[PDB]
Ligand binder design. Structure first.
Ligand SMILES: O=C1O[C@H](CO)[C@H](O)[C@H](O)[C@H]1O
Ligand SMILES: [Mg+2]
Ligand code: NA
Ligand code: NA
Lengths: 210, 211
């Protein structure tokens, strides 16, 4: 049995003065997650590019919790559909960063990707990154994963560039609102919004204000 | 460069002066044919250097100009730098080659409009409001020529001044121009009349475009 005492007002409310209905409760999903003792505790995916975007390096920093051991490995593999495009494997232990050494509980994998299919609101090309925590001879402990979009966002010479091209933002602010359910969001409503937005030539959204 | 008394009068009565080298090669094809040619660098240099040597002590002179309508050649870049080195006290401007070249401290277009772009190939005339904020652009904009006052004209003049006042980096311009270049001729009774191009049997000519 879980007991959850939810307060409508807190010192948190002082930072939550959005122009919207003021409601309260357990308004988003509740879940149980089982992780092993030795686990992936964090991972960051970065994609960097050469000048014309014909080559990318996918960089993936992975952190573990649990007992540190020499037989531990991480494999990050990158998939386009059912095709594995790139893969890297390394033991834990980052590069030296200061006088006290490095992160023994971290590893960075770097995968080369030639002619990456680039992500944009026009063509949302995605790859699949799978992060496997495993033993040296390939016994899986656990896997995490995310969708990867190869794209560079940068400001140069006063312009916001996506993949080297100046954006024109056809944006809208969107609160999480439902006339019956209040501030509870469901997939159907979210999909309905995205469809209507794209059908009406929007390419961007602001999470106003949370 | 003007008659030397002009600068004395500007010093004393108080007018800001753009002193301009006697260099215009407008009729060349392309416009920079001579000014990009190192063979014409000595002749161009004397027109710049001897102006500076003559007029550099006049307080009314606040800006040097490399000339007008001669495109943008390497010779302009050399002479821009010569002035910057010899007289750091005054900005250098020059319009040729698109009004915003490496040979000018000031974006100095001719007849660029307030709101409307004129996107000519190579040398576009942007809306002056748009020109200021082109990616990487930081310089002030002062039209070296605007509001062409030919005949019944100066329509839209107020539009320039509203923009000059609203935008800090739009710091004004020089109207084209002060005085009709008409000449006096006389009829059979000795009555004087105002003449323009062609009236002296001069041909080819550009008619009333001198006024
Ligand atoms: O500036 C704003 O104006 C809107 C008025 O409807 C609304 O209050 C937004 O949350 C706020 O950011
Ligand atoms: Mg507000
Ligand atoms: Na101004
Ligand atoms: Na004229």
């Amino acid at each position: 049995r879980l007991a959850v005492m939810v307060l409508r007002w807190s010192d948190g409310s002082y930072l939550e003065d959005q122009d919207m209905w003021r409601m309260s409760g357990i308004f988003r999903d509740v879940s149980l997650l089982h992780k092993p003792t030795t686990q992936i505790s964090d991972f960051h995916v970065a994609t960097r590019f050469n000048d014309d975007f014909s080559r990318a390096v996918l960089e993936a920093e992975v952190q573990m919790c649990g007992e540190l051991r020499d037989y531990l490995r991480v494999t990050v593999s990158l998939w386009q559909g059912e095709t594995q495009v790139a893969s890297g494997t390394a033991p834990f232990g980052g590069e030296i960063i200061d006088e006290r050494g490095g992160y023994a509980d971290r590893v960075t994998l770097r995968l080369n990707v030639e002619n990456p299919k680039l992500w944009s609101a026009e063509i949302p090309n995605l790859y699949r990154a799978v992060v496997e925590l495993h033993t040296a001879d390939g016994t899986l402990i656990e896997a995490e994963a995310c969708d990867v979009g190869f794209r560079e966002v940068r400001i140069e010479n006063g312009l916001l560039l996506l993949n080297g091209k100046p954006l024109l933002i056809r944006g809208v602010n969107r609160h999480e609102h439902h006339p019956l359910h209040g501030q509870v969001m469901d997939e159907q409503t979210m999909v309905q919004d995205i469809l209507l937005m794209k059908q009406n030539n929007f390419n961007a959204v602001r999470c106003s204000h949370y | 460069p003007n008659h030397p008394l002009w600068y004395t009068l500007c010093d004393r009565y108080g007018l800001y002066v753009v002193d301009e080298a006697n260099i215009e090669t407008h009729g060349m094809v392309p416009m920079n044919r001579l000014t990009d040619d190192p063979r014409w660098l000595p002749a161009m240099s004397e027109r710049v250097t001897r102006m500076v040597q003559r007029d550099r002590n006049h307080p009314s002179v606040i800006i040097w100009s490399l000339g007008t309508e001669s495109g943008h050649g390497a010779n302009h870049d050399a002479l821009y730098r010569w002035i910057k080195s010899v007289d750091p006290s005054r900005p250098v401007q020059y319009e040729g080659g698109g009004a915003d070249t490496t040979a000018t401290d000031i974006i100095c277009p001719m007849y660029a409009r307030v709101d409307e772009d004129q996107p000519f190939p190579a040398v576009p005339k942007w809306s002056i409001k748009k020109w200021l904020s082109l990616p990487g652009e930081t310089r002030p904009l002062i039209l070296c020529e605007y509001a062409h006052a030919m005949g019944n004209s100066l329509g839209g003049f107020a539009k320039y001044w509203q923009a000059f006042r609203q935008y800090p980096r739009l710091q004004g311009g020089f109207v084209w121009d002060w005085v009709d270049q008409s000449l006096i001729k006389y009829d059979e009774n000795g009555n004087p009349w105002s003449a323009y191009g062609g009236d002296f049997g001069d041909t080819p000519n550009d008619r009333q475009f001198c006024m």
